Amino acid sequence: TGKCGPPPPIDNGDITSFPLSVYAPASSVEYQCQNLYQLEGNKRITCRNGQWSEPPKCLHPCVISREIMENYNIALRWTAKQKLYLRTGESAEFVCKRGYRLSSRSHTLRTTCWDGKLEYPTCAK
Amino acid sequence: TGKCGPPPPIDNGDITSFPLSVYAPASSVEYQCQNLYQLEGNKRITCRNGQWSEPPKCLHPCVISREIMENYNIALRWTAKQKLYLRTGESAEFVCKRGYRLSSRSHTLRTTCWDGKLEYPTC
Numbered sequence: 017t018g019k020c021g022p023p024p025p026i027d028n029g030d031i032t033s034f035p036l037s038v039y040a041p042a043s044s045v046e047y048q049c050q051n052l053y054q055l056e057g058n059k060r061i062t063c064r065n066g067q068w069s070e071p072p073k074c075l076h077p078c079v080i081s082r083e084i085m086e087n088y089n090i091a092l093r094w095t096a097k098q099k100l101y102l103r104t105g106e107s108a109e110f111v112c113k114r115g116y117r118l119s120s121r122s123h124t125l126r127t128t129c130w131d132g133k134l135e136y137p138t139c140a141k
Numbered sequence: 142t143g144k145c146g147p148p149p150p151i152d153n154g155d156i157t158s159f160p161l162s163v164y165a166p167a168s169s170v171e172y173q174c175q176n177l178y179q180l181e182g183n184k185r186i187t188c189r190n191g192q193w194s195e196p197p198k199c200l201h202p203c204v205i206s207r208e209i210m211e212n213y214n215i216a217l218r219w220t221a222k223q224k225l226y227l228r229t230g231e232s233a234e235f236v237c238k239r240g241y242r243l244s245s246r247s248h249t250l251r252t253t254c255w256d257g258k259l260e261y262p263t264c
Contacts, residue, residue, distance in 0.1 A: 020207065021204070025202060025204060028153055037223065066208060076150070082146025100146075100147040101147065101160070
């Protein structure tokens with residue numbers, strides 16, 4: 017019996033159809049994440065008993081921070097082949113600046129961006 | 142001296158120019174919010190002493206809840222029944238469903254969207 021109101025917005029993501037004021041039971045609408053956002057969960061929500069099915073989250077990309085690399089004495093190995101912004105699941109390959117050795121308890125030299133977070137490595141003289 | 146790295150991404154907002162690997166001192170780039178979002182803070186950030194200044198947040202729109210409305214014995218005043226999504230700062234004017242009166246003593250019939258949250262009236 018229960019119809020659904022309009023579909024809820026989500027961060028960095030849109031519906032692929034124009035919103036209606038009222039949706040019938042079993043109606044579905046479909047979401048789509050912004051370009052560098054990784055669509056996650058169900059791409060379709062469906063109207064089940066007055067309720068909207070839960071909408072996906074859009075996983076954030078990463079920026080590579082010059083601020084940090086400068087601090088942690090690191091540089092990019094393939095500077096030309098290196099994207100400044102990373103989709104989730106895309107990696108970064110660093111290297112120690114000349115005159116520096118890799119830290120001990122540090123993270124590895126290659127690091128995948130996961131939803132906004134990037135684990136950087138550390139270097140010492 | 143004190144170049145900046147790529148500018149920081151913000152939710153539901155992009156920069157207006159193509160992003161660069163390195164920005165000179167005094168550089169500035171500009172944020173704009175996705176269509177139904179409202180930019181709060183400085184639209185423009187600037188590179189000083191190797192650091193980007195604070196980026197704006199993009200305040201959220203509100204979706205009018207049917208589930209809520211029916212439950213509060215309210216509905217949209219007719220000429221506004223098509224305004225499903227409110228930009229922050231945009232208002233929804235409510236009326237009481239036939240029969241009920243303004244509850245004792247809820248928030249006003251007129252109510253404003255602030256960053257995705259709407260304070261509904263009750264009847």
